[PDB]
Amino acid sequence: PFEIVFEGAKEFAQLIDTASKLIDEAAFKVTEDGISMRAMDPSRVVLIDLNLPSSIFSKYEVVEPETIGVNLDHLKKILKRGKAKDTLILKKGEENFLEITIQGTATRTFRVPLIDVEEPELPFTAKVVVLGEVLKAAVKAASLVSDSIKFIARENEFIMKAEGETQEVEIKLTLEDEGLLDIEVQEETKSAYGVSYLSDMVKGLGKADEVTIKFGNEMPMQMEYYIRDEGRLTFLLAPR
């Protein structure tokens, strides 16, 4: 059992939405340290990891740790009602359901039935930090000419390109012109990924959100987004 409170119901709903474009169900592990969730999309191309430390909650009381499985569509239908300044209360007793209360100009309580559903070294050579807007725009442009997008990172430079038989799309950003917030590379690094997957990954991101990307030659890419600084949503995407 536990009682967890988050200030900013709307922001919490947005996080859940952004973390679940690719999945239908997830097992949330609730412990004394925080809430965690790990899942693979249906195609087995992306790994999703969410970590929400007790530090981002206004009240965090866990009597006994638990792992609650839920249908995300059902959960999102409820969280969708939350307003910007609403308080979100998550409670679990002995009964097999999650009690969700949204408290704002009015207090509304809902119940979400619980379900079961069952649950390599990565030597990255490049790290780049960019605004969600960059990725959102890059993916849309790439999709005009290909189903895959190529990432290239060199000292102080980040390039995203896509091409077909005769068409091409290329976006070159630099630290100097501030298209990147930061960039660190050990050696020139190149890899390509499926546009469909990247689209679902950054769709829920805000234009001004900070995104950290790490990858390597012909390797998977790790994308991270932080919530309230301490929380983190991480995606690991297989290369194409």
CATH number at residue 88: 3.70.10.10
Residue-number span of the structural domain to which 59 is assigned: 1-240
128-149: b or e for each residue (b if 16 or more CB lie within 10 Å)?
Answer: bbbbbebbbebbebbbebbebb
Contacts of 152 (CB under 8 A, 6+ apart): 158, 159, 160, 161, 188, 189, 190
Task: Provide the token pair at 210.
Answer: 């900070």
33-71: b or e for each residue (b if 16 or more CB lie within 10 Å)?
Answer: ebbbbebebeeebbbbbbbbbbebbeebebeeeeebbbb
Coil vs helix vs strand at 65: coil
Cβ atoms of 90 and 73 within 8 Å: the answer is no
Structural domains counted in the chain: 1
What was the elucidation method? X-ray
Cα 151 to Cα 3: distance, rounded to the nearest angstrom: 43
Specify the long-range contacts of residues 143-148, CB closer than 8 Å, at least 24 apart: 143/195, 143/199, 144/169, 145/169, 146/195, 147/194, 147/195, 147/196, 148/192, 148/193, 148/194, 148/195, 148/240
Q: Which of 64, 68, 57 is nearest to 2 (CA)?
A: 64
Q: Which single residue is written with the structure tokens 């990954």?
A: 201
**Helical (H) or strand (E) element with 185:** strand 182-185
Resolution (A): 1.8
